[PDB]
């Protein structure tokens, strides 16, 4: 999920611009829901996942807001001490405490129902996995007991008219989510919201802690601690699930890292490239980042250094020369299935070989499997989410930085071999592999592009539509499931705010019993494909002027 907020110091023909691209995969019907609310203190427009009462992506004519997953560490696991003689109890603060328990029955269509028990301690629900007669792990979420508060904080924030009223609600949202602000005067803001535990001294948050009591959290850190910035000197706020702030620790996920190699640099670059950006230029950053190969910029220098001394005819050399001439912006050929340039295939093969040779080689099995992914892995239907730099690649990146990396290389991923030699061996593998497949004329290589699928199953893998309702788009785009842009004080409009979004396939997922698809069942699909967008209306006059239908209800609570 990405977002860029451009403030007054960097906005052209406007005072602030907000472009949000939440990334949850692609689904039919649409992942988000378009809604406008007017009354009882609210006056908003925008769209929101699963039609939550609170709009995650929207504005109220005075301010605008957005989110991207935070990925801060707000979950710890407690190793609970059990006793075979006291089933259902666990030792805590010197006493055998009774676990919470409940019976559940899974009713199964055309199947026999299944009954089982779920267990919970003072730290959280008990995991099913990793159980012994003496141990069980509890998943402790810092937001536990604050779920509803976050749902409402997300609702009430829509009534905010300034940074102070908005941060008051950001302080109540306990999940680990980055919130963004913008307003009609050109002010912009960012808060890495969420509840984060105040851990005991000596507690390494990447590893489990005993649940006997001595390691319980001291409580939760105060809002003061949450990374935030209002009107940054840079004039912009950019995020792609990267680190909020210097020294701020990431999620403990072994596959997740905030390091020198981060895809967000791709956005920072385009925003800094131009002193000021217009709304249309800000929007164009979607199309560019969505086509940008994310590894080229990270490894190109290393590739160049390794091949800089080879003779013209060396094929390893020509592969690298091919990458050098490339901007890393993938485009489809006329056939609608292959990419114009073979760069990503080259990088994919090479990178896969490097990880096998380095990181994978230094990690004991079967943990080595965790670092083998190049980050290009996909199926026929294309990626199920965003493309990122793989964890193995981020580790490899620090190694190739040598002394420029702040991470001590306790072990040499290159195991004593010159880096050039290993980089060359990998380039050799790449050449054998691709030349064998596509021939030895690089210039006529038509490698496969990624495609994109709006799946009929929701992110859970549960059908939310009939299979046949699945939609397809030839060009995979590493972009938001939905994209919305709010432009404050636009100089070419009669309104103090303009807003656009795209909810593909369409606003409605309705199909009549006879199979007649709603008029708004797929009217935003092509628009999504060509980086188009439609206006979001707010004022009564705009809504009235663009009305298609109307209905009045009269109800007594």
């Amino acid at each position: 999920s990405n977002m860029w907020v451009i403030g007054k110091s960097k906005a052209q023909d406007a005072k602030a611009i907000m472009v949000n691209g939440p990334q949850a995969g692609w689904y039919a019907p649409a992942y988000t829901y378009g809604i406008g609310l007017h009354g009882a203190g609210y006056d908003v427009t925008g769209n929101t996942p699963f039609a939550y009462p609170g709009l995650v992506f929207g504005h109220n004519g005075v301010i605008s807001w957005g989110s991207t997953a935070g990925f801060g560490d707000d979950v710890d696991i407690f190793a609970e001490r059990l006793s075979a003689e006291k089933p259902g109890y666990y030792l805590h603060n010197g006493k055998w405490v009774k676990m919470l328990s409940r019976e559940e029955t899974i009713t199964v269509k055309n199947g026999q129902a299944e009954t089982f028990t779920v267990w919970r301690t003072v730290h959280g629900n008990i995991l099913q996995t990793d159980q012994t007669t003496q141990t069980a792990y509890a998943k402790s979420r810092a937001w536990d007991g604050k779920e509803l508060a976050s749902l409402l904080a997300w609702t009430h924030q829509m009534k905010a008219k300034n940074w102070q009223e908005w941060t008051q609600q950001a302080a109540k949202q306990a999940l680990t989510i980055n919130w963004y602000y913008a307003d009609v005067n050109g002010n912009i803001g960012y808060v890495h919201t969420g509840a984060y535990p105040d851990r005991q001294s000596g507690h390494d948050p990447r590893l489990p802690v005993p649940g006997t009591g001595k390691w319980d959290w001291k409580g939760l850190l105060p809002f003061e601690m949450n990374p935030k910035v209002y009107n940054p000197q840079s004039g912009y706020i950019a995020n792609w699930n990267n680190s909020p702030q210097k020294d701020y620790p990431a999620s403990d996920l072994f596959a997740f890292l905030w390091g020198g190699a981060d895809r967000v640099t791709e956005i920072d670059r385009l925003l800094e490239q131009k002193p000021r950006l217009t709304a249309d230029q800000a929007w164009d950053v979607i199309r560019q980042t969505s086509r940008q190969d994310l590894n080229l910029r990270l490894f190109l220098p290393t590739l160049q250094a390794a091949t800089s001394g080879l003779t013209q005819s060396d094929p390893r050399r020509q592969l690298v020369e091919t990458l050098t001439r490339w901007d890393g912006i993938n485009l489809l050929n006329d056939d609608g299935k292959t990419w114009q340039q073979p760069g990503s295939a080259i990088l994919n093969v090479w990178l896969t070989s490097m990880l096998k040779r380095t990181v994978v080689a230094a990690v004991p099995m079967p943990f080595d499997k965790w670092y083998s992914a190049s980050g290009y892995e996909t199926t026929q239907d294309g990626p199920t989410g965003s493309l990122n730099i793989s964890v193995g690649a981020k580790i490899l990146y620090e190694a190739v930085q040598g002394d420029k990396s702040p991470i001590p290389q306790a072990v040499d991923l290159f195991a004593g071999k010159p880096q050039q030699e290993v980089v060359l061996a990998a380039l050799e593998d790449t050449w054998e592999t691709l030349s064998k497949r596509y021939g030895n004329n690089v210039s006529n290589w038509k490698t496969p592009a990624m495609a994109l699928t709006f799946r009929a199953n929701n992110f859970f893998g549960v059908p939310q539509a009939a299979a046949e309702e699945t939609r397809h788009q030839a060009e995979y785009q590493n972009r938001g499931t939905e994209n919305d842009m709010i432009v404050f004080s636009p100089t070419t409009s009669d309104r103090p705010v303009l807003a656009w979004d795209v909810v593909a396939p369409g606003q409605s997922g309705f199909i009549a019993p006879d199979g007649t698809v709603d008029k708004h069942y797929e009217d935003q699909l092509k628009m999504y494909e060509n980086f188009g967008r439609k206006s979001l209306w707010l004022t009564k006059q705009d809504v009235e002027a663009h009305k298609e239908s109307q209905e009045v209800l009269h109800v007594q609570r």
Partner: protein, 206 residues
């Protein structure tokens, strides 16, 4: 009129609700959601509560069990009961709005029932505040803010320490799964501020 809810849809079918009080506003919201995404919402309801097998069968039992093992419904119900009347009105209204439309759908299913219901062999029932809340709770929270691999991490570290020895092992874990990396591009620039907390990276809890 305090009891009047106006629903106006734009050229893309996007609904705009106009209402005087909280309950009526979110009543209108739920009403249009039911009109627009009834099957999607029903299945999302089942996904977030672990009742998919009820309609899809045995291939989703494990799914259901995992969902239910990941939360404590009573605790969610208790947060809902603690809600002020104003906040409660958000969920009650939303639930009620959906129910109004759902009642009309179940009354004239030959014209209003989304085809997927016929196809999947079941009909939609009424929602309660809990149902509405769980849509958000089960997605945003139980899934998008519930990430950890600490047990796996301890296994990796344990294997690193076995392979490279203790001090070395610890060092390599901090190389593969660093706690922080100062060269990480951050949304807030170093000139603005830095995070003041320092953490242990030695697994000193053992």
């Amino acid at each position: 009129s305090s009891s009047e809810i106006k629903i106006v849809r734009d050229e893309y079918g996007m609904p705009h609700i106009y209402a005087n009080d909280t309950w009526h506003l979110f009543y209108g919201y739920g009403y249009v959601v039911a009109q627009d995404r009834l099957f999607q919402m029903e299945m999302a309801r089942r996904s977030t509560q672990g009742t998919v097998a009820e309609v899809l069968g045995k291939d989703f039992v494990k799914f259901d069990k995992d969902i239910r093992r990941n939360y404590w419904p009573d605790a969610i119900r208790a947060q809902i009961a603690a809600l002020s009347p104003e906040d409660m009105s958000i969920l009650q209204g939303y639930a009620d709005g959906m129910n109004a439309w759902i009642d009309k759908v179940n009354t004239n299913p030959e014209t209003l029932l989304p085809k997927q219901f016929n196809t999947f062999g079941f009909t939609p029932k009424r929602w309660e505040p809990f149902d509405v809340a769980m849509i958000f709770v089960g997605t945003m929270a139980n899934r998008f803010s519930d990430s950890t691999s600490e047990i796996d991490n301890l296994a990796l570290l344990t294997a690193l320490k076995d392979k490279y020895g203790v001090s070395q092992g610890m060092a390599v874990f901090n190389q593969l799964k660093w706690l922080v990396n100062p060269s990480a591009p951050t949304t807030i620039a170093v000139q603005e501020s830095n995070y003041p907390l320092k953490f242990n990276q030695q697994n000193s809890q053992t």
